Write an enzyme that holds these catalytic residues in place. Structure first.
Site, PDB file in Angstrom:
ATOM      1  N   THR A 137      -1.667   1.385   6.044  1.00  0.00           N
ATOM      2  CA  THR A 137      -2.576   1.943   7.154  1.00  0.00           C
ATOM      3  C   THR A 137      -2.394   0.919   8.334  1.00  0.00           C
ATOM      4  O   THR A 137      -2.749  -0.338   8.474  1.00  0.00           O
ATOM      5  CB  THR A 137      -4.111   1.986   6.382  1.00  0.00           C
ATOM      6  OG1 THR A 137      -4.194   2.581   5.572  1.00  0.00           O
ATOM      7  CG2 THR A 137      -5.109   2.333   7.937  1.00  0.00           C
TER       8      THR A 137
ATOM      9  N   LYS B 230      -5.651   9.299   9.173  1.00  0.00           N
ATOM     10  CA  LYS B 230      -6.310   8.229   8.202  1.00  0.00           C
ATOM     11  C   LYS B 230      -7.605   7.583   8.771  1.00  0.00           C
ATOM     12  O   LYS B 230      -8.653   7.420   8.264  1.00  0.00           O
ATOM     13  CB  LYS B 230      -5.201   7.276   7.557  1.00  0.00           C
ATOM     14  CG  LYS B 230      -5.681   6.192   6.833  1.00  0.00           C
ATOM     15  CD  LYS B 230      -6.546   6.669   5.581  1.00  0.00           C
ATOM     16  CE  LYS B 230      -7.160   5.415   5.000  1.00  0.00           C
ATOM     17  NZ  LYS B 230      -6.046   4.521   4.596  1.00  0.00           N
TER      18      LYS B 230
HETATM   19  N1  LIG Z   1      -7.026  -1.495  -1.361  1.00  0.00           N
HETATM   20  C1  LIG Z   1      -7.736  -0.624  -1.132  1.00  0.00           C
HETATM   21  O1  LIG Z   1      -8.995  -0.196  -1.835  1.00  0.00           O
HETATM   22  C2  LIG Z   1      -7.350   0.456   0.105  1.00  0.00           C
HETATM   23  C3  LIG Z   1      -7.364   1.907  -0.074  1.00  0.00           C
HETATM   24  C4  LIG Z   1      -6.795   2.584   0.495  1.00  0.00           C
HETATM   25  C5  LIG Z   1      -5.854   2.452   1.480  1.00  0.00           C
HETATM   26  N2  LIG Z   1      -5.915   0.918   2.114  1.00  0.00           N
HETATM   27  C6  LIG Z   1      -4.861   0.209   2.924  1.00  0.00           C
HETATM   28  O2  LIG Z   1      -3.593  -0.028   2.301  1.00  0.00           O
HETATM   29  C7  LIG Z   1      -2.896  -1.013   2.745  1.00  0.00           C
HETATM   30  C8  LIG Z   1      -2.651  -2.049   1.599  1.00  0.00           C
HETATM   31  O3  LIG Z   1      -3.939  -2.275   0.762  1.00  0.00           O
HETATM   32  P1  LIG Z   1      -3.715  -3.171  -0.620  1.00  0.00           P
HETATM   33  O4  LIG Z   1      -5.339  -3.525  -0.943  1.00  0.00           O
HETATM   34  O5  LIG Z   1      -2.573  -2.835  -1.437  1.00  0.00           O
HETATM   35  O6  LIG Z   1      -3.114  -4.782   0.265  1.00  0.00           O
HETATM   36  P2  LIG Z   1      -2.973  -5.856  -0.608  1.00  0.00           P
HETATM   37  O7  LIG Z   1      -3.574  -7.185   0.317  1.00  0.00           O
HETATM   38  O8  LIG Z   1      -3.976  -6.172  -1.928  1.00  0.00           O
HETATM   39  O9  LIG Z   1      -1.429  -5.977  -0.934  1.00  0.00           O
HETATM   40  C9  LIG Z   1      -0.460  -5.920   0.050  1.00  0.00           C
HETATM   41  C10 LIG Z   1       0.739  -6.788  -0.788  1.00  0.00           C
HETATM   42  O10 LIG Z   1       1.776  -6.623   0.340  1.00  0.00           O
HETATM   43  C11 LIG Z   1       2.453  -8.178  -0.161  1.00  0.00           C
HETATM   44  N3  LIG Z   1       3.151  -8.546   1.289  1.00  0.00           N
HETATM   45  C12 LIG Z   1       2.720  -9.068   2.158  1.00  0.00           C
HETATM   46  N4  LIG Z   1       3.617  -9.371   3.197  1.00  0.00           N
HETATM   47  C13 LIG Z   1       4.751  -8.971   2.648  1.00  0.00           C
HETATM   48  C14 LIG Z   1       6.273  -9.131   3.279  1.00  0.00           C
HETATM   49  N5  LIG Z   1       6.305  -9.507   4.333  1.00  0.00           N
HETATM   50  N6  LIG Z   1       7.107  -8.817   2.168  1.00  0.00           N
HETATM   51  C15 LIG Z   1       6.949  -8.384   1.158  1.00  0.00           C
HETATM   52  N7  LIG Z   1       5.550  -8.207   0.721  1.00  0.00           N
HETATM   53  C16 LIG Z   1       4.469  -8.552   1.376  1.00  0.00           C
HETATM   54  C17 LIG Z   1       1.459  -9.274  -0.266  1.00  0.00           C
HETATM   55  O11 LIG Z   1       2.220 -10.010  -1.396  1.00  0.00           O
HETATM   56  C18 LIG Z   1       0.314  -8.150  -1.201  1.00  0.00           C
HETATM   57  O12 LIG Z   1       0.744  -8.105  -2.643  1.00  0.00           O
HETATM   58  C19 LIG Z   1      -3.937  -1.548   3.795  1.00  0.00           C
HETATM   59  O13 LIG Z   1      -3.346  -1.353   5.088  1.00  0.00           O
HETATM   60  C20 LIG Z   1      -5.044  -0.753   3.743  1.00  0.00           C
HETATM   61  O14 LIG Z   1      -5.991  -0.701   4.630  1.00  0.00           O
HETATM   62  C21 LIG Z   1      -6.231   0.017   1.026  1.00  0.00           C
END
Ligand SMILES: NC(=O)c1ccc[n+]([C@@H]2O[C@H](COP(=O)([O-])OP(=O)(O)OC[C@H]3O[C@@H](n4cnc5c(N)ncnc54)[C@H](O)[C@@H]3O)[C@@H](O)[C@H]2O)c1
Ligand SMILES: NC(=O)c1ccc[n+]([C@@H]2O[C@H](COP(=O)([O-])OP(=O)(O)OC[C@H]3O[C@@H](n4cnc5c(N)ncnc54)[C@H](O)[C@@H]3O)[C@@H](O)[C@H]2O)c1
Ligand SMILES: NC(=O)c1ccc[n+]([C@@H]2O[C@H](COP(=O)([O-])OP(=O)(O)OC[C@H]3O[C@@H](n4cnc5c(N)ncnc54)[C@H](O)[C@@H]3O)[C@@H](O)[C@H]2O)c1
Ligand SMILES: NC(=O)c1ccc[n+]([C@@H]2O[C@H](COP(=O)([O-])OP(=O)(O)OC[C@H]3O[C@@H](n4cnc5c(N)ncnc54)[C@H](O)[C@@H]3O)[C@@H](O)[C@H]2O)c1
Lengths: 294, 294, 294, 294
Positions: D94, D169
């Site tokens: 997102t 979204k």
């Molecule tokens: N978590 C939720 O309940 C939720 C629900 C719907 C949508 N979203 C959206 O989805 C997106 C991600 O959510 P999330 O909770 O999985 O985030 P998160 O922080 O839990 O996971 C992100 C992952 O990306 C990895 N990462 C970061 N930089 C990187 C790099 N450059 N190269 C490779 N890997 C890298 C990190 O190691 C991490 O494990 C957000 O933008 C959020 O708004 C979240």
């Protein structure tokens, strides 16, 4: 004491003019020929380009509308490469702190002493040489710069290091939006409950409700004959520009995870106003949200 | 020149005291004995009752907390029946305009010349005899009343006819709430973006963001050592009372179908504050919504 | 099973009509003759007065516009003195809880079993006999009353004791205002960023942004051809009435020292709308704040 | 059908797992080794790098936290140069529409068929394979992509061209914030005026105040035992993440000059919440602003 002046708009033109009337030589540039011509008749030489203007200059001053344009013009090819040796750079546009801290650091990365020096005041104060500058950067630069600021303005505040100027400006103008709206709604509440506008105004002005707007800029038509409100909100500081400033304030708040319920609401309301076709009216036109009979 | 004084609280006591120190004879009454005793030691006679106090009086002054109490005490059995002939009635509580217009009309319906004269200022100004009065009613009464107002206060504004006092007060205090919140959020935004509180404050004070609060009542601790903020928000004007005033402002707006987005938001925020246990703190404690580290 | 029906307006008329079509005898009254005449042609007898109507009745039902009128009509001389022995009183207007708790207690002080039973639904649902009732008072009364409620409506919720009906109604309609505004602003944000209204709508409806309005009452013209928005906001539930309800919600919040930032903001916005001349339009006309091209 | 999966966080891990359980071969990468290890044990090969993972892949999917990271990883040196020939790129983070339209255009400028496909749902739905995708881009790509979306999710909406996904979204989640806050304040208003939480809830759910939150996510503790509120707001969707989304919504509004009074206010309130130390709690913890006794 030879200056490059880039951006000769509502604020740029009179600031550049007051520098000439102070005895400085200017190389001016602006996308709009009639603006360069204005300053040429008052005794400046037109530069073929921002770059040209700068080539030969002790200090470079810019007064442009927003973040985009300013980063564009300084940020590669961008004029900032072509710039200069021990030249003083004065960035007086109102732009996002982030955006200013970035430019500052590139100034550093070239020995150039730069300041962010956004202006508060209006077209009327730009002309009178009474503007307020809010400056980030080194005292070093500032003192070198002071004589220019004094030519274009009056109050010169040193607000901090790289970016502080923009921060103070943004904070100040957001509070302005708030007190102005707060003033317009209070004005309209009293009137609707039977009070005479002028009477209500003086009371709040002399009292705990007192504020800049009530002092000098009443949004209620007739209260101050000299104000935009008394001439159907023509001239002054555009509603559209105030919205922009509020936008910059949101930007700063998000970086610092700051809460700005009044400022954000003020923003929401200014956008409504823009929907109603008032972008080019004075920001006090916000009064129209509370009074129909206008 | 014999006065009945009913209500000797935070504001009542010092107002009544300054009347004594001006050379008036008072009959005081208050639900709380230690408050009557305060004024008795300073040279007043206690009255057994509001009614008693009034029996014998040239002017009757009341300083009570809210609408309920005031209507209660004047509005039948209610003391207003028992009152008087050509006696001057001064209703200085802050109450809803509607509520004051009602009482005024009953004053009319008995020849009694009454004024709504709510007070602005605080405990500190009540003591110093520097309060501001905002008065609805006849110039007739007002001039008869002036010498008393001058004893308890300084600025005396005639705001209009029956009820105008309350209207101006409500309007003024709502705008106050707005600029104070606007000031606290702006303060905390600049600090979070790297500015020194004191520096930021002075800039906005001297600039278009300028307002009463920044002049005399900064919500940020340390900025003004003399302010509630510099002593953890003790004393001053209670947050709970400000919420009440905002409530009265809502009441006026609904009658006039007025829109008060900032005032209403301010109200919403003060209620949050009351939820957090701050009802008895100074209204600038609103600063705590923006700064955790406090 | 003889009923007195007082108030035959937009909601009163069809509710009273559905009671007749259910087999009840009615004595109707209304300040407006054409409204009594409507119900007389459908087979009711006109009563010379509220009092008259009531004299002879098993149950008395009232459907009036606001607090003032309702307290007026029940509260001395007031019809409530003249009323009845073991008669069931059904107060279906939407009024302030305080105001309803007061009336309830006077019902008590006369053995009369009364209920506050405000209605949710609209003119369309009043006609179809599908209204929702939200009821304060005794289960005792309720069950006695149920057969009537079923004739005029569908969902019958027992919300609590004296006043609970009004409380639930006020709470429900405030949240409605919020989701409707929230829906209009979201609609206009997506459209302005390039989305097709209908597409955006379905997405949010089926998703976490989903709500009543998106289900059945989209504020965006064209999305639902059947909705007020698709016919320039004529008919439906008046903006002016929604503002009134929001006003009642403020009243409840102040009593309970509750914070209602969204509801209060919604209120502020509806008042703006009334300033723009939209009082008699459907409450979804709030969409016009976000879209000019309309 | 060989996939590169980059980002194995709260959402990334279970999405990648459901792709494996669907019969796809994955090359996973993540800054955090324990996250790669999770997916390796479930039968994926770890890639030394984003670049590595991608080298060899039919489709590249990324699920990262924000705009910064995503542009960083795709935008030069940046992995997007090293990418691929006729490979399908699925950007499910997102991020700001602007930011997504930029990346899309670079996909174009390399023949790569890319989609922005942000996800709605939570950790619980990511695990169950029931997520909702909101997709910008070509039907062309979409249909190629569908079988994957079906493996990780249920509702698949085509929201428009480049960027539309992010737009829908952002719009959806802003309205969510609004109805959730609106739900928490309404809940607390009724309770404070004497209603039983569970009773009040069901009424509004079945009525015009009805919304997603009341259906499935009540912010009031005890109402739904299964909800974050009933377990002191642990787990679920973080308050901090909701604030981020609101931030993105502001960004979109400023580009389109849209007014978002409710969304912006919601944002202001979430930031307050973050000040109170609740960043890692479920977004319904917003209930705590209205109820102290918690
Ligand atoms: N978590 C939720 O309940 C939720 C629900 C719907 C949508 N979203 C959206 O989805 C997106 C991600 O959510 P999330 O909770 O999985 O985030 P998160 O922080 O839990 O996971 C992100 C992952 O990306 C990895 N990462 C970061 N930089 C990187 C790099 N450059 N190269 C490779 N890997 C890298 C990190 O190691 C991490 O494990 C957000 O933008 C959020 O708004 C979240
Ligand atoms: N106008 C006011 O009342 C007011 C008051 C105080 C502060 N400010 C702030 O000052 C800034 C400028 O205000 P303004 O009203 O003078 O703007 P303006 O639009 O009137 O003038 C900007 C000038 O910059 C020139 N320009 C744009 N791009 C250029 C380029 N790349 N190279 C050379 N010249 C270029 C334009 O030709 C124009 O004449 C804004 O950021 C504003 O918020 C405005
Ligand atoms: N306190 C402030 O800083 C401040 C400042 C300006 C204006 N005001 C306004 O002035 C009003 C009063 O302020 P305050 O702080 O003095 O209130 P207070 O609570 O301190 O004092 C009210 C006094 O009235 C007395 N009283 C109550 N009912 C009475 C009865 N029926 N008969 C006789 N006496 C009775 C009480 O005993 C009490 O001593 C409020 O409406 C407030 O909004 C307050
Ligand atoms: N109209 C709607 O779409 C709607 C929907 C749900 C709930 N409500 C609520 O229901 C209530 C009534 O709604 P409405 O639209 O029927 O109002 P209305 O104005 O259309 O009708 C009120 C009727 O009461 C009569 N009346 C007024 N004073 C009277 C008196 N003292 N004695 C006898 N009759 C008197 C009037 O003649 C009028 O016909 C309101 O409080 C409203 O908020 C309205």
């Amino acid at each position: 004491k030879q200056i490059a002046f880039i951006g000769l708009g509502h604020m740029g033109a009179p600031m550049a003019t007051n520098l000439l009337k102070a005895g400085y030589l200017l190389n001016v540039f602006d996308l709009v020929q009639s603006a360069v011509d204005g300053l040429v008749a008052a005794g400046a030489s037109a530069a073929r380009s921002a770059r040209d203007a700068v080539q030969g200059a002790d200090v470079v001053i810019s007064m442009l509308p927003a973040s985009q344009h300013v980063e564009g013009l300084y940020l590669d090819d961008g004029l900032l490469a072509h710039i200069a040796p021990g030249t003083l750079v004065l960035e007086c546009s109102t732009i996002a702190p982030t955006s200013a801290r970035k430019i500052h650091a590139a100034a550093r990365e070239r020995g150039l002493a730069m300041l962010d020096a956004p202006v508060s005041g209006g077209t009327a104060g730009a002309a009178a040489g009474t503007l307020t500058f809010m400056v980030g950067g080194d005292a070093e630069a500032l003192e070198k710069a002071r004589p220019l600021f004094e030519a274009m303005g009056r109050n010169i505040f040193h607000a901090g290091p790289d970016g502080a100027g923009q921060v103070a400006k943004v904070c100040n103008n957001q509070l302005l939006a708030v007190l102005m709206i707060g003033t317009a709604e209070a004005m309209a509440l009293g009137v609707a409950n039977g009070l005479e506008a002028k009477v209500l105004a003086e009371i709040m002005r002399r009292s705990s409700g007192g504020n800049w707007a009530l002092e000098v800029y009443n949004p209620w038509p007739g209260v101050m004959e000299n104000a935009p409100a008394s001439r159907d909100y023509s001239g002054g500081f555009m509603a559209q520009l105030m919205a922009k400033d509020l936008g910059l304030a949101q930007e700063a708040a998000q970086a610092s995870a700051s809460s700005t319920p009044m400022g954000s609401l003020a923003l929401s309301l200014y956008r409504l106003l823009l929907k109603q076709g008032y972008a080019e009216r004075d920001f006090s036109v916000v009064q129209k949200l509370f009074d129909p009979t206008q």
